[PDB]
C-alpha cells in the first residue's frame, strides 16, 4: 500500500507470477479481492446503483 502505482503494478505482477504455485487458494482469493475492492465500488455506483 505504501508505494506509488507505477511500482505497485510491477510489484503485483511479480507477486502473481512468483508466489502463486505455492500458496493456498483462499489466500490468493483474499489478495485478489483486496486489490480489486476499489473498482467494485466505482462499477456499482456508475452502472448498478441507479
Amino acid at each position: 500500500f505504501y508505494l506509488t502505482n507505477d511500482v505497485s503494478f510491477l510489484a503485483h505482477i511479480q507477486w502473481m507470477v512468483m508466489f502463486t504455485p505455492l500458496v493456498p487458494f483462499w489466500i490468493t482469493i483474499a489478495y485478489i479481492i483486496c486489490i480489486s475492492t476499489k473498482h467494485f465500488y466505482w462499477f456499482f455506483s456508475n452502472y448498478l446503483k441507479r
Binding site: 502463486t20 504455485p21 505455492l22 500458496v23 493456498p24 487458494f25 483462499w26 490468493t28 482469493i29 483474499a30 479481492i33
Partner: protein, 100 residues
C-alpha cells in the same frame, strides 16, 4: 456387494476391506464410508476419490472434515466448479471483515 445406507438420487455406501464386485470387473476397496451426489457407483479405492460429486472418508467425522480438502489446495485444481468455491470464501471474508 457392500451394504447401502440410502438409495436413490443421493447414495451412501459403507464398505469393509474386501474385493467387492458385481457383473463386470473387480477391484479392491479399503474399509470406510462413501457418499456421492449422484446414483453412480462409488468405492474407497483410488481413481474413485478423484471424480466430481464423490466424497469419501475414513469415518463420518473424517468424511465431513475431508469435504473441505480442496479448499486448501493450491489454485489450479478445479475447472468449472471453481466459481462457487471462490464465492463461498469471498462472501464469508467480506462479511466477517467489513462488518465485524
Amino acid at each position: 456387494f457392500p451394504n447401502t445406507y440410502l438409495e436413490g438420487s443421493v447414495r451412501v455406501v459403507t464398505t469393509f476391506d474386501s474385493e467387492y464386485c458385481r457383473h463386470g470387473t473387480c477391484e479392491r476397496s479399503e474399509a470406510g464410508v462413501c457418499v456421492s451426489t449422484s446414483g453412480r457407483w462409488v468405492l474407497n479405492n483410488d481413481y474413485y476419490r478423484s471424480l466430481p460429486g464423490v466424497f469419501c472418508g475414513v469415518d463420518a467425522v473424517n468424511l465431513l472434515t475431508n469435504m473441505f480438502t480442496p479448499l486448501i489446495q493450491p489454485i489450479g485444481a478445479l475447472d468449472i466448479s471453481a466459481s462457487i468455491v471462490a464465492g463461498g470464501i469471498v462472501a464469508i471474508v467480506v462479511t466477517c471483515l467489513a462488518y465485524y
